[PDB]
Amino acid sequence: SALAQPPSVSGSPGQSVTITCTGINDYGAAYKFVSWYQQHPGKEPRLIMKNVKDRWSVTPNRFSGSTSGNTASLTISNLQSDDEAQYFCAVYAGGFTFPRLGGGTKLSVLSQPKAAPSVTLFPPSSEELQANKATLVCLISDFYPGAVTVAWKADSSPVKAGVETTTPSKQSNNKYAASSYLSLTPEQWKSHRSYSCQVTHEGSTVEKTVAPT
Amino acid sequence: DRLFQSGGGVSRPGGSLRVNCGASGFTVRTHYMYWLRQSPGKGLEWVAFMNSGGSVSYVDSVRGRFSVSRDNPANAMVLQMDALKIEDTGTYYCARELREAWYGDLRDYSGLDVWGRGTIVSISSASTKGPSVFPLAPGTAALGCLVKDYFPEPVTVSWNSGALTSGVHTFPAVLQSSGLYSLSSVVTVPSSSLGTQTYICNVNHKPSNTKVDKRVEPK
């Protein structure tokens, strides 16, 4: 399966940040070649770094890698606005068919103080239920930086099907907004005790719960 | 060394599309090549691998539906996509991987150093469609309008024909896997105004000549 990366890291301009990549030795003892890729929004990925710490082409001295056997690290110093991007680690060894990919880290360069999200969760309306449909609406606003993870639960177990979540987009007040929708059948809605929208942001979580009523 | 792409596009479930991947500076047919895809706002996932000898490996979820072939006169490879599903929507990339291997003994590995810019693939059963508008029932209270399942963009939303603007937040739409859009608009009002001040969201979707005024009432 996949390597483990934080969904997001953030750092202040001038400072340094480290993106970690764990699980490198979950599949054998063969030497692992670790590569890092940078992808700006709307653009294709770019190879940054190979063999943990060997910089690729015109990757500045600011990008360095280290490694702890099971966790490889990419450290970016003198952080600046161009560094805002998604970063993917990859591990290849002899015998792999595909390199293993990490899930990606969104890197944010803080140009203002962090702001926690406000979260509003609406249950399905009886009008929509009458149309044999059910939509849970989770509205997320006023956060910074613009990176959130949204998870849904039915009672206490995670739900993945029927979830549609926007990419965060800048509000007029310079913080961000996002929406997540959980589509259910009316039978699914009524047959559970509650549904929950969980919003993770800079390692903190807000959870809102609704119940058929 | 450059890769360039073309093709892709829009198709109903079950249809077919093709993505091309050509090289300059090197020949596809002597290099290790990869296809990847990325669902919007998500991460990279593998699609197919072609080694320098031309054997192709597929991820399980596309085997039997997708096939990769060499087009040597165009110094290219082609991703033929048949029996398309909703899950196949995304931006598709081809890439070249640099490695040093004698026999099956890898000596060095650089990674995917050359990438195409990506080709958009959209699997959708969507055509022009007006939205269904549902009320989101409400110190202060938050009430709103859910504007569900419309196509194409955009819809506009106002409240009380524009007499109510303070406290309004209309959220960017979500593009669903169906290919349809949905958005919500929510307004924050004094709770003492509920059941004495009427709240109506005015939704307009000019591509389908649909206008909806929904009264949003307290439960």
- Residues of chain B neighbouring A88 (CB-CB closer than 8 A): 43-44
Spell out the SS3 assignment of chain A. Answer: CCEECCCEEEECCCCCEEEEEECCCCCCCCCCEEEEEEECCCCCCEEEEECCCEECCCCCCCEEEEECCCEEEEEECCCCHHHCEEEEEEEECCCCCCCEEECCEEEEECCCCCECCEEEEECCCHHHHHCCCEEEEEEEEEEECCCCEEEEEECCEEECCCEEECCCEECCCCCEEEEEEEEECHHHHHHCCCEEEEEEECCEEEEEEECCC
Testing the interface with B: which of A51, A91, A139, A189 to mutate, by most B Cβ within 10 A? Answer: A139
Same domain, B118 and B139: no
- Per-residue b/e over B150-161, b at no fewer than 16 CB within 10 Å? bbeeebebbbbe
Cβ atoms of B21 and B3 within 8 Å: the answer is: yes
Q: Do A181 and B135 touch (CB under 8 A)?
A: no
Same domain, B10 and B85: yes
What's the sign of the alpha-carbon dihedral A188, A189, A192, A194?
Answer: positive
Beta-bridge partners for B77: B21, B70
In order of A140, B25, B171, the CA distances from A199 in angstroms are 8, 47, 17
Q: Do A98 and B34 touch (CB under 8 A)?
A: yes
The resolution in Å comes to: 2.2
What would the two tokens of residue A79 be? Answer: 């952080």
Same domain, B49 and B149: no
* Domain around B171: 132-215
Phi, psi of A186, deg, nearest 5: -55, -35
How many separate domains does chain B show?
A: 2
What's the sign of the alpha-carbon dihedral A26, A28, A31, A33?
Answer: negative
Residue found by looking up tokens 């504007």 in the block: B147
Cβ atoms of B150 and B180 within 8 Å: the answer is: yes
Burial of A116 (0-12, 13-18, 19+ CB in 10 A): middle
Chain A: nearest CA to B183, how far in angstroms?
8
Closest CA to B185 of B131, B130, B132, B136: B136
Same domain, B115 and B17: yes
- Domain-ending residue, one of B61, B96, B123: B123
What would the two tokens of residue A53 be? Answer: 């710490």
CA distance B86 to B84: 7
**B120–A contact, CB cutoff 8 A:** no
What would the two tokens of residue A35 be? Answer: 């590569």
Cβ atoms of A149 and A119 within 8 Å: the answer is: no
A-contacting residues in B 66-95 (Cβ below 8 Å)? 93
Identify the experimental approach.
X-ray
- Domain-ending residue, one of B123, B148, B174: B123
Same domain, B141 and B93: no
- Residues of chain B neighbouring A135 (CB-CB closer than 8 A): 134, 146, 148, 182
Q: Do B146 and A135 touch (CB under 8 A)?
A: yes
Same domain, B10 and B73: yes
Chain B: nearest CA to A163, how far in angstroms?
9
- Domain-ending residue, one of B63, B93, B123: B123
What would the two tokens of residue A129 be? Answer: 């239920």
Same domain, B114 and B85: yes
Testing the interface with A: which of B112, B153, B183 to mutate, by most A Cβ within 10 A? Answer: B112
Same domain, B104 and B211: no
Same domain, B7 and B112: yes
The CATH number assigned to the domain holding B114 equals 2.60.40.10
Same domain, B65 and B167: no
Q: Do A98 and B57 touch (CB under 8 A)?
A: yes
In order of A16, A137, A180, the CA distances from A163 in angstroms are 35, 10, 7
Same domain, B9 and B112: yes
